[PDB]
Design a protein around this ligand. Sequence first.
Ligand SMILES: O=C(CC1(S(=O)(=O)c2ccc(Oc3ccc(Cl)cc3)cc2)CCOCC1)NO
Ligand SMILES: [Ca+2]
Ligand SMILES: [Ca+2]
Ligand SMILES: [Zn+2]
Ligand SMILES: [Zn+2]
Length: 160
Amino acid sequence: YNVFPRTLKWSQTNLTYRIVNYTPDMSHSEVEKAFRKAFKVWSDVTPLNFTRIYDGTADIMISFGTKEHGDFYPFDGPSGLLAHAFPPGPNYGGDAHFDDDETWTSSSKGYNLFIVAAHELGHSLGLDHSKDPGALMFPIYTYTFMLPDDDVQGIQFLYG
Ligand SMILES: O=C(CC1(S(=O)(=O)c2ccc(Oc3ccc(Cl)cc3)cc2)CCOCC1)NO
Ligand SMILES: [Ca+2]
Ligand SMILES: [Ca+2]
Ligand SMILES: [Zn+2]
Ligand SMILES: [Zn+2]
């Protein structure tokens, strides 16, 4: 596993997240279940706790956008770039963006939202990409859930 320069991590163990908008190809309920499961993957192995808020600014703002969407990481339409997230810190730190031009699903037909979200949240928590091919933080999409050992070691190094 790998961490970001200066080992970025959250100072508090009680973090908030907010789903700003939704993708059209999935019902609001399935999008919410996807993220709920994504956060659980990480809360189960760390002393971290996540609370979903609906108004205001949360520690982790989740949004869907297309092409140019407000930052220095524009999307590229169907396929290619799927999503990106920012490491722990103020402002957009911790935020996760998902390409709305993708066909997100709860199954395995298109790009599974849960698995991508789980990967992105790893970044939101302080983990950079891993060199271990079987790690969730490996930079390649492959959907077949139990968090691989490399990821557990990495996240527990930061918050354990
Ligand atoms: O790493 C990225 C972006 C890309 S990605 O958009 O293609 C991408 C995002 C999340 C992914 O998640 C998973 C990783 C591993 C497994 Cl097993 C499942 C999902 C995969 C690719 C594109 C640029 O180069 C690295 C990969 N940020 O998370
Ligand atoms: Ca894309
Ligand atoms: Ca933040
Ligand atoms: Zn973005
Ligand atoms: Zn990544």
